[model samples]
Target: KTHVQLSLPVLQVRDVLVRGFGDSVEEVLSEARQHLKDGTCGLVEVEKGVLPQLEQPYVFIKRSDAAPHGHVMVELVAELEGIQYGRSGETLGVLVPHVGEIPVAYRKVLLRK
Candidate 1:
């Protein structure tokens, strides 16, 4: 057998969002801001079971470091109206790049329709 060591760089959570459902957006935003001020991880739980056809709220975390290897993670608990069709009720997580503003279906619809 071979021994392996796993090391992960120190990362601080820069932001967090609990979207989807019908929970108060302002409440989540305020709590997140407070956590950021204290330099600690923040978490917010949005409304659950709002849509009879939907599942849970959407969760995402943004992290950054002084190095060049920074990224974002999106944890989807339920599918929104316009993105990732067929995945009506599923919990998943994916890593994303920390670049320009990432677009969400809700924002796009607000502007287009």
Candidate 2:
């Protein structure tokens, strides 16, 4: 691997606990683990308006070598205009481009008050 610097707006999910809609955590984790090994992508759904900076709906996810087992490391790579909101309307989700959306509770970033 080489030292690559991505000069784009970025967001991160420290450790993705759960992914997608209407599935058990165990199921999501199992699938995510395989995706990591397979070098595929996964989508992370964020509620609309939560991420004001990210005007685009779909953001690419990047998995790093440093991440632990069963834990997904997410990073913003690009935007896909073709992708729209999921069935749970009005939410802006990030797409890794291979797997389905990984669902998580919507919470506001405190921004270190």
Candidate 3:
């Protein structure tokens, strides 16, 4: 008489495909503000610019120190290929930024029409 058995093995790897900004909104906007003051970028302010809102809220999860911190509730505007937009909420304005052919990020403040 005899006995038979089977075994299997698998390989595992780490995930590393995330690259995002490590600055707060205010910090980024502050940088943009300095650029505007120094004319380093194409920063401008608009009086009648409209931003379209999102259909659903966005959850921004933090990933650092090899673990997750927390999530930020982001339920606001969006920028398409060249269009601007935002979500419905308390009236708020922002100094927007864009990366153009100037080898740097540019900013502009938008005020709803």
Best-matching candidate per TM-score? 2
| Residue runs of model 2 more than 4 Å from their true location after superposition | 1-22, 43-113
Tens digit of lDDT per residue, candidate 1, span 1-113?
Answer: 12111111222123223222233334333443343334332222223532332223232232211112222222222233433422222221221122222233110000000
TM-score of 2: 0.27
- lDDT per residue (tens digit) for residues 58-107 in model 2: 33344433322333333323333464222222223453324333334432
lDDT of each: 0.25, 0.34, 0.25
What does candidate 3's lDDT look like per residue over 5-112, in tens digits?
111111111111111112444344345344334443221221252222211111111111111123212122333344334344432222233233232222222212
Stretches > 4 Å off in candidate 3: 1-22, 43-113
Q: Over 4 Å off in model 1, which ranges?
A: 1-22, 42-59, 62-113
Alpha carbon deviation, residue 25, candidate 3 (Å):
1.2
How accurate locally is residue 44 in candidate 2, as Cα lDDT from 0 to 100? Answer: 46
lDDT of 1 at 12: 17
| Error of model 3, residue 90, in angstroms | 14
Alpha carbon deviation, residue 111, candidate 1 (Å): 24
Say which prediction, candidate 2 or candidate 3, comes out ahead on lDDT: 2
What lDDT would candidate 3 get against the real structure? 0.25
In model 2, how large is the Cα lDDT of residue 26? 38
